[PDB]
Write a protein that binds this ligand. Structure first.
Ligand SMILES: Nc1ncnc2c1ncn2[C@@H]1O[C@H](CSCC[C@H](N)C(=O)O)[C@@H](O)[C@H]1O
Ligand SMILES: Nc1ncnc2c1ncn2[C@@H]1O[C@H](CSCC[C@H](N)C(=O)O)[C@@H](O)[C@H]1O
Ligand SMILES: CSCC[C@@H](O)C(=O)O
Ligand SMILES: CSCC[C@@H](O)C(=O)O
Lengths: 336, 336
């Protein structure tokens, strides 16, 4: 798409408003109340403790975005709302949306005007490290991040083969949604996670809870200033490049390569744009979001990633989509 | 449409990142830099005083949104960008977006979770009066609004005839964009604008520099508590109902009626949704925005509006589109 109307510009300009319609509805459990069938404005006001005129305004906004249906003064969940937004649904993720995206990201992106200029004040969150210094933020971000990564981890376990008592290193693997998943999935697979203290202390909870403190250890600290375990069969870097300065990118690949065993695989999951750089829109937007608290970030495209993977010494380099319209998966092999 | 895919939810959830892409770009003069022709990342890094990497991330987000094209390594302004976002463009409204919408509205919407629950915190901005008592806030808001309203004001003059010695009352007419424009058109017209002190203080500047001091006067204050002149020929309310407690809607129509000579016209320009509450999307979302700082706002719909107008006593009551996909205009005549 290339914009033509002033209205089309307005569509983009006021997109934050629609995001906040969804977010607010989530906080007040709107889609959960609709789960048992259509409701009038007044029936909703009673179910949520909101004033009728306010719900009318909230729902009207929702209906206009297709998130709910509006038929004869009664509103109902869209199929997508029933699947993904109703509390308890197998695929529910309203909580990732309202806690991490709304409570943290929305406000945080008020920083980009300064960030894309590397003009941040000191009283701004300028890194993951700085941000996570606040344990209750670290826990707020991780807890939803974890929840959100479980699905993609499963999809991941279906492509790669870690069978054969192997060793996994997840650099920046947070609270362990990917390692925990790949370990439960693969026989005799052991894993290390490199992540910051406050995050690491939270992962240790998720890992002991899974009953896997025998197979999964944290090397705690800043990955860039902390020794990794060498001779690993597989390295996972998921949303690491995005939250890391762009000058680290080359030496990040060299290190991954150096810490691999011959035939070892490197796995990079992240917001990646096509090389023509016209999308995918969700990934480009998320690159920007990360830049808000990572002013030195750069933009990963699939071509660049391919080429630098090869010039690092990797072979069998492949790049494909993971989270539809949002992330990609790059696979690399240190040669046998 | 009625959404079904998790990616469709995602489109909306992260729509706010795209608003911010546009805004950050306006703040740094991106499109004005692309005004003379296509540019590369280094050149754009140069003209915007941004790092080539942060410009790449920014422009890439912009391309995937449609705001720019991405060709042979060089970025270009979309046609819409050329004409609406380039400073000095005949129809430029970039400053309205980055100053009023980005610097004020985006942050204000952080209140809706509480505002929709009629439970804002004491430190929350909870009305126009509250908000504009801050002169910097009033200035920032009103210099943009004046600009974004000049075009629609010309459109409104072309739709109506206020000739032959008329008196116009513009309630919450702000810095007088409309009034100035309709006075410029109809040489014998006199106007009266009713708006808050910090706003009127600005308006007078815009009025004097137009050479209209003799024909346009302010009545400073909360319109709800201040006496309006009587025997008017037209009464304009443009974006007044949106930001006012729903409590007060009936009795605004009545006063307008009582302050009109027989055969005089009431004009209501505002974000109005349709009675089926299906849209327009943009009006529905601005209704939610105003509610963030007007917790007793109610949804203005077209049917209610025409009905209340007849209820109050008007005739020749029509409602039609005004700003495409965003606002409507309701015309009514007090019987001859
Ligand atoms: N320099 C650094 N050192 C250690 N951890 C880092 C880091 N930079 C970013 N991180 C961590 O990288 C993680 C990014 S968020 C994603 C979590 C997980 N890898 C997943 O895919 O679900 C965060 O947990 C953050 O704490
Ligand atoms: N209760 C009130 N009394 C006086 N002015 C009010 C008001 N409530 C809102 N307003 C004003 O109405 C204006 C809304 S913005 C639009 C201004 C102008 N009528 C235009 O359409 O371009 C603001 O200037 C705001 O200050
Ligand atoms: C930096 S948050 C990205 C995580 C998101 O993709 C998810 O877990 O669904
Ligand atoms: C408070 S929004 C101003 C109205 C808008 O539609 C414009 O044209 O500027």
């Amino acid at each position: 798409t290339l914009l033509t109307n002033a209205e089309e510009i307005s569509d983009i300009a006021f997109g934050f408003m629609g995001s906040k319609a969804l977010f607010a509805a989530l906080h007040h459990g709107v889609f959960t109340c609709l789960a048992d069938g259509p409701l009038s404005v007044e029936e909703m006001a009673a179910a949520t403790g909101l004033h009728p005129d306010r719900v009318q305004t909230l729902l009207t906004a929702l209906a206009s975005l297709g998130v709910v249906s509006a038929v004869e003064g009664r509103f109902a969940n869209s199929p997508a709302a029933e699947s993904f937004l109703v509390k308890g649904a197998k695929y529910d993720f309203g909580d990732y949306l309202r806690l991490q995206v709304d409570r943290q990201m929305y406000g945080l992106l008020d920083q980009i005007e300064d960030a894309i200029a590397n003009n941040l004040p000191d009283d701004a969150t300028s890194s993951y490290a700085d941000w996570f210094s606040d344990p209750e933020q670290a826990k707020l971000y991780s807890n939803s991040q974890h929840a959100g990564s479980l699905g993609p981890a499963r999809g991941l376990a279906k492509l790669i083969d870690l069978s054969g008592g192997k060793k996994l290193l997840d650099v920046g693997g947070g609270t362990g949604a990917f390692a925990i998943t790949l370990c439960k999935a693969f026989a005799d697979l052991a894993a290390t996670i490199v992540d910051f203290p406050n995050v690491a202390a939270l992962g240790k909870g998720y890992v002991e809870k899974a009953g896997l403190s025998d197979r999964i250890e944290y090397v705690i600290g800043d990955a860039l200033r902390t020794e990794w375990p060498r001779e690993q069969d597989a390295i996972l870097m998921s949303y690491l490049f995005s939250g890391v300065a762009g000058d680290e990118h080359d030496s990040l690949l060299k290190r991954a390569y150096d810490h691999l065993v011959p035939g070892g695989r490197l796995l990079i999951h992240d917001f990646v744009v096509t090389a023509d750089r016209t999308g995918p829109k969700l990934a480009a937007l998320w690159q920007l979001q990360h830049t808000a608290f990572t002013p030195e970030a750069r933009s990963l495209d699939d071509e660049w990633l391919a080429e630098q993977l090869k010039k690092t010494g990797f072979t069998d380099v492949k790049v494909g989509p993971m989270i539809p319209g949002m992330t990609m998966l790059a696979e690399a092999v240190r040669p046998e």
